[PDB]
Design an enzyme around this catalytic site. Structure first.
Site, PDB file in Angstrom:
ATOM      1  N   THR D   1       1.008  -0.839  -0.519  1.00  0.00           N
ATOM      2  CA  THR D   1      -0.174  -0.085  -0.019  1.00  0.00           C
ATOM      3  C   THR D   1       0.781   1.179   0.032  1.00  0.00           C
ATOM      4  O   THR D   1       2.132   1.126   0.715  1.00  0.00           O
ATOM      5  CB  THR D   1      -1.011   0.056   1.041  1.00  0.00           C
ATOM      6  OG1 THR D   1      -1.796  -0.814   0.711  1.00  0.00           O
ATOM      7  CG2 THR D   1      -1.582   1.682   1.159  1.00  0.00           C
ATOM      8  N   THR D   2       0.316   2.016  -0.882  1.00  0.00           N
ATOM      9  CA  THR D   2       0.765   3.401  -0.831  1.00  0.00           C
ATOM     10  C   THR D   2      -0.307   4.756  -0.938  1.00  0.00           C
ATOM     11  O   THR D   2      -1.044   4.555  -1.883  1.00  0.00           O
ATOM     12  CB  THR D   2       1.902   4.254  -2.154  1.00  0.00           C
ATOM     13  OG1 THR D   2       2.656   3.043  -2.641  1.00  0.00           O
ATOM     14  CG2 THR D   2       2.655   5.103  -1.869  1.00  0.00           C
ATOM     15  N   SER D 129       3.293   0.680   3.017  1.00  0.00           N
ATOM     16  CA  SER D 129       4.389  -0.443   3.010  1.00  0.00           C
ATOM     17  C   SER D 129       4.868   0.470   2.142  1.00  0.00           C
ATOM     18  O   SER D 129       6.928   0.991   2.203  1.00  0.00           O
ATOM     19  CB  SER D 129       4.376  -1.254   2.226  1.00  0.00           C
ATOM     20  OG  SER D 129       2.866  -1.774   0.965  1.00  0.00           O
ATOM     21  N   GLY D 130       4.566   1.453   0.464  1.00  0.00           N
ATOM     22  CA  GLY D 130       5.609   2.260   0.070  1.00  0.00           C
ATOM     23  C   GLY D 130       6.277   3.525  -0.226  1.00  0.00           C
ATOM     24  O   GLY D 130       7.155   3.799  -0.696  1.00  0.00           O
TER      25      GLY D 130
END
Ligand SMILES: *[B]([O])([O])[C]([C][C]([C])[C])[N]C(=O)C1=[C]N([C][C][N]C(=O)C2=C(O[C])C(O[C])=C(O[C])[C]=[C]2)N=N1
Ligand code: NA
Ligand code: NA
Ligand code: NA
EC number: 3.4.25.1
Lengths: 245, 218, 241, 199, 230, 244, 229, 236
Positions: D1-2, D129-130
């Site tokens: 995810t970002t 996460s990104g």
């Protein structure tokens, strides 16, 4: 709140419970329900107050309820209150059976419901259950048994007894004709129809059942309308045969 | 288990295999994994078989209660919300992976619902042990607004890819087309795979010690 | 009108089978001294009531019986104002909670049913009185079109082509049943002007902008629009002839 | 995810990726992570999907009723606190980060982070996460007083740069631009992503 | 009909009022506080010679250094006596010491208006019992009175029961602050013999004393028959 | 009516809850409290009747701070009024906890009004024998003043009065053009109205309690300082001779 | 709350609130139910006070599950509590047993609920008698349940205004193997005895139960039966 | 009469008679007086004996080092409400390590005693307190009642014939603030015996004093303890 309280669970000045007595007056209007012990069996015979042309007849009975494999009962009073109490009796019978893996003895099942009925007279501020029950059964300790109970949570064991409309008139009639130790189910069936002839005779208005022990297993069965009607004609002929002589 | 779903022009198609495995042993050959929820809402069962069974049972009852009260055909968003909030409270211990498909007032709808209580609205999806084979078939040959004939063929091809490819999955393809005008439950839509047998023992070959006969007489 | 026990003090049956405490909650609606009217058009639905400002020291914006329950739904209350607000708070809760539990906009019949089922609990349990107030909901249903829905202190509810409640209820429902029998092209103009003229001719008052308040939902604009005094002024002068 | 939210004169731009991962498997390559809380308030979902949705549903429910009780649109500070208090109360149990942003009549365009039940207003924030891989880029490339278009460019560039590097991030870029005028939703596809060095 | 926690216009609880009225029906008891010891005497009020005299415990041991005499509803008292007995041993457990006569009486006085209908687990009515505590703690020999209201106070001498009014007049004349214990013991039995419509004897009464040196002692038939003389 | 007037769970035949009406009579018998909405804020003035000179000044304080930005002025049974202030304090504290900013006065009025309404439905409890006025100023919301009664009705007011001289105080407020005037001016005129409506013949001597909230105080409910109160008390006494 | 019975025994020995609730039923808008050989009928008067009332909105004849239906005489709000509860009780049977609930067993469960409010704390009983149609093994079922919590299986009966006239009308005119065509026609004729006005598709409501479960009849379906009267 | 028995029942006059009946518990209870200077706060209590043999009733109770009380009403409600004050004081010393402000303690009594006046099957506290205490705002006398109302005071009296005491105190108000300790105690004693008839007056048996200020913690003086204070002025 305190103004609106009926106060069902109190002693009146005389030293007695008003709602308990007033509930027994409701029973005195309801249908004539009786029971008779015998050597080879036990019976219950009740007045059938649900009597109309347009009634359906779904169930095997109307006032008679089976409880355990070895037990049954009939009622007198408010039928809705009876449906609660009979459901709870059935629950008690299986609760015993789950625990011990034997059928509940007849006195024990009656005391269990009568402890609950007594609670509604002593605490909770609730009106009592307006039902008297007549119980029949067999167990390994005392065998063929008949019990009576009432809204107070008081019970007694009887050889023969009655509740409902013309209760006292039926019991005094049973006190004449019942012979202790000497009565069979055939002779008891004659006396049941004799007493209901006094109090109330078509077979739609009568409802009979017989608990017996055949080949090591209890047998509870309602009588059909062919069995009742032939027993009515046997009373009418036996009544008429004495009248001539 | 391979279960899958597919949105097309006139409606939705839901697919499922028929194998039920106990560890690495085939318990059931023929079982329905496509469950009834509403008249035009059905649901595919994957993950823990009891949790897939009882949640779909429970939400069906909730939709019957909801439809009877409203006097309306139920929405597919409502089944997804009920499932989610049931499944979320149990924190994934109720292990029901579900593909929920149907038609309502607002058109054809397909939702992926995972056992922790996450969801995804989609045009195609797959779940269970052979999800990847079926999902690979969908990615290869899906387009928007398929025909009734092409969707059945694609969805059969997706569930078949799982049936052969996944050891958990097996047997026949059950299916369920949900058009606008009702739902056609095409049970045993396909059969990917096709003996001598006969071990007739003589009566008396089995040795017997006790015998009791209880007659019944109706 | 036979009576025995505490049947006039708590919600229990009289000998005739009536609940006198329920009947007294209907009398409590009239104590407000106001009459509400609600009408259903072809493509809309409207509600109107008295915006009675006797004291100049009141903030006339805060004086209102029209309330927004959701975006698409709004209601007119009539009766005891404390009971009326309380019933509105519960309508907002149940409407929002519905959208949380079930994931869509609560329909107008079900919100009205929900509040009516709550009112029944007061009708049966002795411990509390019924709410002396009357909720008339309006909103655009997607399938069924525009909807008007009243519910009583007794716990009744029903959909209506038009309805009224308050002091001059019987006169307002008598006026509306005369006009509904005649054919009309029930437009936004037709529906609004019937509501104002019904409340006007029953009470026998030529209203000004400050003397009434109007709430409405159309097919084009289904969000609950409470009309300003300027917008009310246009409909009044349209009835100049 | 970002995920990423950006603040400007009279509005906010708000962006996410679209990958729902299950380890190495992509469960959903086209998931919208920008969920509406109110008419002019969104949140960018991140971490656990089941946790993130349940908070967004409960925040939406709470803010819907809160909005009707005031007879006004809710404040973004109010919606940020609604998400904060839920995330804080069940911080041991939940494993999600809901970045909240929108527009007000009072304080205008504003962006809030709620990482583990905290609350902080930032000019821009990033999460998932990104976001790890693009802290250098957002420090380098951000300057104050950007337009709507400059913010949409910057949000696309950052999320595309992350999607290149992060395995858990991928698919399409979903974009939301919130102003007084309304909500402009837009989907930048995987076909038309802005190219950078990728060797 | 009204609630249990209802004030009269005079400014006092009806059920507390009526709990004081219940003590008049109860049999009379006397306690006299002296520097050499606290004596406690009570009439049994024996309705039949079939009734065993020794099983009417109207004076009882609370601890080795405290006693309590009772009048009124005898059953109501046994709840309060047990709670006192529990309190003393709970205090011994926690603190490794004896309670004062005041501290015990206060603990029982806390239970007096712990009755009511709504907001309850609990008692419906008060205890219709007056208690005459009497013991010897670090502050010399002490005698304490308690009533259904919860009001408790130290007493040089006091009585409770049917002839509480009559006996208190006799205590006023007879009591002297510098007297001995044996004079105070014989004073009580004189004052009890008058008020009893039965005749005083060893089976018909209970006496008990507490000194500094000696523990709580309840008097036997032989020990009562020796004192009987006067 | 009689018979039907004991419980708030019981309507009368005319459709009236007499227990709520009897709680409003305890307010009508209580002393006069007033408040007016200015251009730049809201001011409160209270007729605090001194039962004994033995009591200190600032005892039986019928003006309260509900929040830093909100002021409560009460009339009725004072024990009930203080418990209502404790309800409003907590309710305002709950808003700050939930949403991270100062509670709006209309919302605060509604949420405390539903608290007041809850006690008018049951035999198990009685209504609050207390009406009170909540007042506030803000940047965006501006000056606002709401009053609540024993029934639980909440309305907004440009001017408002509760107590003995409910009607008498209101006709004196109608003369003032409060909408144009400021808080600095209105303190004189609020202090004037209490001295007029005060019955010197019937009642004992009194202390004027004055509080306010506005642009003067940066939207913060403070007491009126002794400089300005005594200026307004002097204005009240000397201008009473000017119409006598 | 109040933890004591509002329904209690009088010196005569009668539960007075139940007989007072029966007066509320007896003074309700009338309702009829008839058991044919091949099916069951339920019909009732839906005559509201004005033409302003939307007739399609709220219903007297309501389903419980796909094979059981319901109708009442007496109190409308009380009825709606029993409908919601009966609907729950049906699903609670279906969830456990995976079988459509027997009609006898649904009546017994709702009877137990109706009994509950003649005894439990601070509540009056329901001012409603229910009529419950169904289809179980492969045959029709019709049951009454009245405020007491007592229930009676009927071939046919009436309720509400002129229930005595409806019952005697039915007794002579009912045959024990009627066709469902004829029974629907009989049910409307039973209502026309007690009616005050010209009957229409709008101002009465009918539902039926047979082989393919329970449903409410449409206005046009009713209009066909009204054409030949 | 109909509106006499329950605290929830409002009268048609706009009054709650069970509060006003509970107020009479204070009045028929014995007399007690409280007053303050610039530096100290004093309580004086006429201790009512049951009979002349029995010892005198304890009327002044200890709450904290910085607060104590004198009572008038039902002793069980006095002790219950005393323990509530003792506990809330103990909470403040535990939590904050700082004595509880007297006005704040008095506010909690008002909040607590109000609760049962609004609830069915409950009653008001049949006891009035005069509460002496010193804090960062100097000495205080506070009054409380069964009605849950509380009053900050220069001085006060409550109990049997306490109108006599209130009349004495209202004259000597400006004197109290300037007085030293011995003059302030003597003022409180003269207010107390004004309640008594001309036949009987103050002795060491029937009087108790309770004193707190800047120097001294809440000390109580009963028997020979009192003898210093009485021996000064004794006529009329
Ligand atoms: B995004 O945060 O990746 C996205 C955002 C949602 C709002 C859609 N969330 C997800 O993709 C997502 C992932 N999961 C559950 C699967 N968990 C993990 O992948 C995971 C793993 O496993 C690789 C590990 O280590 C193995 C950790 O570290 C302990 C954490 C998570 N649900 N939604
Ligand atoms: Na396989
Ligand atoms: Na009620
Ligand atoms: Na990537």
């Amino acid at each position: 709140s305190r103004r609106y309280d009926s106060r069902t669970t109190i002693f009146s000045p005389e030293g007695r419970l008003y709602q308990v007595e007033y509930a027994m007056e409701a029973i005195g209007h309801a249908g004539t329900c009786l029971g008779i012990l015998a050597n080879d069996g036990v019976l219950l015979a009740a007045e059938r107050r649900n009597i109309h042309k347009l009634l359906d007849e779904v169930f095997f009975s109307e006032k008679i309820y089976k409880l355990n494999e070895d037990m049954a009962c009939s009622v007198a009073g408010i039928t809705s209150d009876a449906n609660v109490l009979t459901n709870e009796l059935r629950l008690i019978a299986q609760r015993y059976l789950l625990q011990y893996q034997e059928p509940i003895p007849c006195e024990q099942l009656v005391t269990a419901l009568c402890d609950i009925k007594q609670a509604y007279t002593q605490f909770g501020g609730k009106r009592p259950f307006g039902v008297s029950l007549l119980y029949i059964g067999w167990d390994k300790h005392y065998g063929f048994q008949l019990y009576q109970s009432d809204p107070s949570g008081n019970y007694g064991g009887w050889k023969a007894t009655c509740i409902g409309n013309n209760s006292a008139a039926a019991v005094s009639m049973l006190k004449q004709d019942y012979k202790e130790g000497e009565m069979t189910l055939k002779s008891a069936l004659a006396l049941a129809i004799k007493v209901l002839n006094k109090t109330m005779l078509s077979a739609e208005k009568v409802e009979i059942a017989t608990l017996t022990r055949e080949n090591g297993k209890t047998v509870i069965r309602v009588l059909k309308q062919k069995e009742v009607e032939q027993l009515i004609k046997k009373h009418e002929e036996e009544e008429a045969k004495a009248e001539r002589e | 288990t391979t279960i899958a779903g597919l949105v097309f022009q006139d409606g939705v198609i839901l697919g499922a295999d028929t194998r039920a495995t106990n560890d690495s042993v085939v318990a059931d050959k023929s079982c329905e994994k496509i469950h009834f929820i509403a008249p035009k809402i059905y649901c595919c069962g994957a993950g823990v078989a009891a949790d897939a069974e009882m949640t779909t049972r429970m939400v069906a009852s909730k939709m019957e209660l909801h439809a009877l009260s409203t006097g309306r055909e139920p929405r597919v968003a409502t089944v997804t919300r009920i499932l989610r909030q049931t499944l979320f409270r149990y924190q994934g211990h109720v292990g029901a992976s579900l593909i929920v498909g149907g038609v309502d007032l607002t058109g054809p709808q397909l939702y992926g619902v995972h056992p922790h209580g996450s969801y995804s609205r989609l045009p195609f999806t797959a779940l269970g042990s052979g999800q990847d084979a079926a999902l690979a078939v969908l990615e290869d040959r899906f387009q928007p607004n398929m025909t009734l004939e092409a969707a059945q063929g694609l969805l059969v091809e997706a569930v078949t890819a799982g049936i052969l490819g996944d050891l958990g999955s097996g047997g026949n393809v059950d299916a369920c087309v949900i058009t606008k005008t009702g739902a056609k439950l095409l049970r045993t839509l396909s059969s990917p795979t096709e003996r001598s047998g006969r071990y007739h023992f003589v009566p008396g070959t089995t040795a017997v010690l006790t015998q009791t006969v209880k007659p019944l007489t109706l | 009108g036979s009576s025995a026990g505490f049947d006039r003090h708590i919600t229990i049956f009289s000998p005739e089978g009536r609940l006198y405490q329920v009947e007294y909650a209907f009398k409590a609606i009239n104590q407000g001294g106001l009459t509400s009217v609600a009408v259903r058009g072809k493509d809309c639905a409207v509600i109107v009531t008295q915006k009675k400002v006797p004291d100049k020291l009141l903030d006339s914006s805060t004086v209102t019986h029209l309330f927004k329950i959701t975006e698409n739904i709004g209601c007119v209350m009539t009766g005891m104002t404390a009971d009326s607000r309380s019933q509105v708070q519960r309508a907002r809760y149940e409407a929002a909670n519905w959208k949380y539990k079930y994931g869509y906009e609560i329909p107008v019949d079900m919100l009205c049913k929900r509040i009516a089922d709550i009112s029944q609990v007061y009708t049966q349990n002795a411990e509390m009185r019924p709410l002396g107030c009357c909720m008339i909901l309006i909103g655009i249903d997607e399938e069924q079109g525009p909807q008007v829905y009243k519910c009583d202190p007794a716990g009744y509810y029903c959909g209506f082509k038009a309805t009224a409640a308050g002091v001059k209820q019987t006169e307002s429902t008598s006026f509306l049943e005369k006009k509904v029998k005649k054919k009309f092209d029930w437009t936004f103009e037709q529906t609004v002007e019937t509501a104002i003229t019904c409340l006007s001719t029953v009470l026998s008052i030529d209203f000004k902008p400050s003397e009434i308040e109007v709430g409405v939902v159309t097919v084009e604009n289904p969000k609950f629009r409470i009309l300003t005094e300027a917008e009310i002024d246009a409909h009044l002068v349209a009835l100049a002839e | 995810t970002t995920i990423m939210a950006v603040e400007f004169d009279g509005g906010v731009v708000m962006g996410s990726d679209s990958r729902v991962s299950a380890g190495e498997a992509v469960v959903n390559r086209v998931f919208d992570k920008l969920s509406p809380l109110h008419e002019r308030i969104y949140c960018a979902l991140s971490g656990s999907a089941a946790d993130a949705q349940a908070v967004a549903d409960m925040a939406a429910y709470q803010l819907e009723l809160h909005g009707i009780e005031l007879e006004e649109p809710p404040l973004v500070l109010a919606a940020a606190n609604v998400v904060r208090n839920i995330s804080y109360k069940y911080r041991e149990d939940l494993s999600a980060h809901l970045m909240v942003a929108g527009w007000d009549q009072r304080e205008g365009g504003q962006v809030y982070g709620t990482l583990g039940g905290m609350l902080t207003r930032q000019p821009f924030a990033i999460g998932g996460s990104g976001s790890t891989f693009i802290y250098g880029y957002v420090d380098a490339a951000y300057k104050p007083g950007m337009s709507p278009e400059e913010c949409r460019r910057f949000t696309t560039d950052a999320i595309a740069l992350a999607m290149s590097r992060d395995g858990s991030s991928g698919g399409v870029i979903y974009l939301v631009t919130i102003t007084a005028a309304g909500v402009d939703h837009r989907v930048i596809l995987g076909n038309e992503l802005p190219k950078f060095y990728d060797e | 009909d009204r609630g249990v926690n209802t004030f009269s216009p005079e400014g006092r609880l009806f059920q507390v009022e009526y709990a004081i009225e219940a003590i008049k029906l109860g049999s009379t008891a006397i306690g006299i506080q002296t520097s050499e010891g606290v004596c406690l005497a009570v009439e049994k009020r024996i309705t039949s010679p079939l009734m065993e005299p020794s099983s009417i415990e109207k004076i009882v041991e609370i601890d080795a250094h405290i006693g309590c005499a009772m009048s009124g509803l005898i059953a109501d008292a046994k709840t309060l006596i047990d709670k006192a007995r529990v309190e003393t041993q709970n205090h011994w457990f926690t603190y490794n010491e004896t309670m004062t006569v005041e501290s015990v009486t206060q603990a029982v006085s806390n239970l007096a208006l712990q009755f009511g209908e709504e907001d309850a687990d609990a008692m419906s009515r008060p205890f219709g019992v007056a208690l005459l505590f009497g013991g010897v703690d670090e502050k010399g020999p002490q005698l304490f009175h308690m009533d259904p209201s919860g009001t408790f106070v130290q007493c040089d001498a006091r009585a409770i029961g049917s002839a509480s009014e009559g006996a208190q007049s006799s205590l006023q004349e007879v009591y002297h602050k510098s007297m001995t214990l044996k004079e105070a013991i014989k004073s009580s039995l004189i004052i009890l013999k008058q008020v009893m419509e039965e005749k005083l004897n060893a089976t018909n009464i209970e006496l008990a004393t507490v000194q500094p040196g000696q523990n709580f002692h309840m008097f036997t038939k032989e020990e009562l028959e020796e004192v009987i003389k006067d | 009516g009689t018979g039907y007037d004991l419980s708030a769970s019981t309507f009368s035949p005319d459709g009236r809850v007499f227990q709520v009406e009897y709680a409003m009579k305890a307010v009508e018998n209580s002393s006069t409290a007033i408040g007016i909405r200015c251009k730049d804020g809201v001011v409160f003035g209270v007729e605090k009747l001194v039962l004994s000179k033995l009591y200190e000044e600032g005892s039986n304080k019928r003006l309260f701070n509900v929040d830093r930005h909100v002021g409560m002025a009460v009339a009725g049974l004072l024990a009930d009024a203080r418990s209502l202030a404790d309800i409003a304090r907590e309710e305002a504290s709950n808003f700050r906890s939930n949403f991270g900013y100062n509670i709006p006065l209309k919302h605060l009025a509604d949420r405390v009004a539903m608290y007041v309404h809850a006690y008018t439905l049951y035999s198990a409890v009685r209504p609050f024998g207390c009406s009170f006025m909540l007042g506030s100023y803000s940047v965006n919301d501006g000056a606002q003043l709401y009053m609540i009664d024993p029934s639980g009705v909440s309305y907004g007011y440009w001017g408002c009065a509760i107590g003995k001289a409910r009607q008498a105080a209101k006709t004196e407020i109608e003369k003032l053009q409060m909408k144009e005037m400021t808080c600095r001016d209105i303190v004189k005129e609020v202090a004037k109205i209490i001295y007029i409506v005060h019955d010197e013949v019937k009642d004992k001597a009194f202390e004027l309690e004055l509080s306010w909230v506005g642009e003067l105080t940066n939207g913060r409910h403070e007491i009126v300082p002794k400089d300005i109160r005594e200026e307004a008390e002097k204005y009240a006494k000397e201008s009473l001779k000017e119409e006598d | 709350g109040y933890s004591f019975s509002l329904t209690t025994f009088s010196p005569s020995g009668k539960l007075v609130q139940i007989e007072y609730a029966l007066a509320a039923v007896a003074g309700g808008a009338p309702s009829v139910g008839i058991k044919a050989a091949n099916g069951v009928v339920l019909a009732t008067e839906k005559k509201q006070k004005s033409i302003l009332y939307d007739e399609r909105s709220v219903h007297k004849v309501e389903p419980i599950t796909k094979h059981i239906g319901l109708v009442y005489s007496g109190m409308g709000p009380d009825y709606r509590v029993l409908v919601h509860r009966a609907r729950k009780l049906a699903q609670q049977y279906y969830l456990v047993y995976q079988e459509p609930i027997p009609t006898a067993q649904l009546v017994q469960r709702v009877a137990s609920v109706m009994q509950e409010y003649t005894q439990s704390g601070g509540v009056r009983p329901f001012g409603v008698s229910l009529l419950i149609c169904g289809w179980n093994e492969g045959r029709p079922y019709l049951f009454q349940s009245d405020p007491s919590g007592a229930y009676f299986a009927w071939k046919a009966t009436a309720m509400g205004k002129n229930y005595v006239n409806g019952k005697t009308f039915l007794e002579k005119r009912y045959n024990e193997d009627l066709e469902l065509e004829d029974a629907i026609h009989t049910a409307i004729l039973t209502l026309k005895e007690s009616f005050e006005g010209q009957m229409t598709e709008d101002n009465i409501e009918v539902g039926i139960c047979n082989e393919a479960g329970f449903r409410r009849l449409t206005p046009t379906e009713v209009k066909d039966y009204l054409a030949a009267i | 009469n109909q509106y006499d028995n329950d605290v929830t029942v409002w009268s048609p006059q706009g009054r709650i008679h069970q509060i006003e009946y509970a107020m009479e518990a204070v009045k028929q209870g014995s007399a007690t007086v409280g007053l303050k200077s610039k530096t100290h706060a004093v309580l004086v209590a006429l201790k009512r004996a049951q009979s002349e043999l029995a010892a005198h009733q304890k009327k002044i109770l200890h709450v904290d080092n910085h607060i104590g009380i004198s009572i008038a009403g039902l002793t069980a409600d006095a002790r219950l409400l005393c323990n509530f004050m003792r506990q809330e004081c103990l909470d403040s010393r535990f939590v904050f390590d700082r004595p509880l402000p007297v006005s704040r303690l008095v506010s909690l009594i008002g909040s607590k005693t109000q609760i049962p006046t609004q609830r069915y099957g409950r009653r008001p506290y049949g006891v009035g307190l005069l509460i002496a205490g010193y804090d960062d705002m100097g000495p205080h006398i506070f009054q409380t009642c069964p009605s849950a109302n509380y009053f900050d005071c220069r001085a006060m009296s409550i109990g049997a014939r306490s109108q006599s005491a209130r009349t004495y105190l209202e004259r000597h108000m400006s004197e109290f603030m300037e007085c030293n300790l011995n003059e302030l105690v003597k003022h409180g004693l003269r207010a107390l015996r004004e309640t008594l008839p001309a036949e009987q007056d103050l002795t060491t048996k029937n009087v108790s004093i309770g004193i707190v200020g800047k120097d001294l913690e809440f000390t109580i003086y009963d028997d020979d303890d009192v003898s210093p204070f009485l021996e000064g002025l004794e006529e009329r």
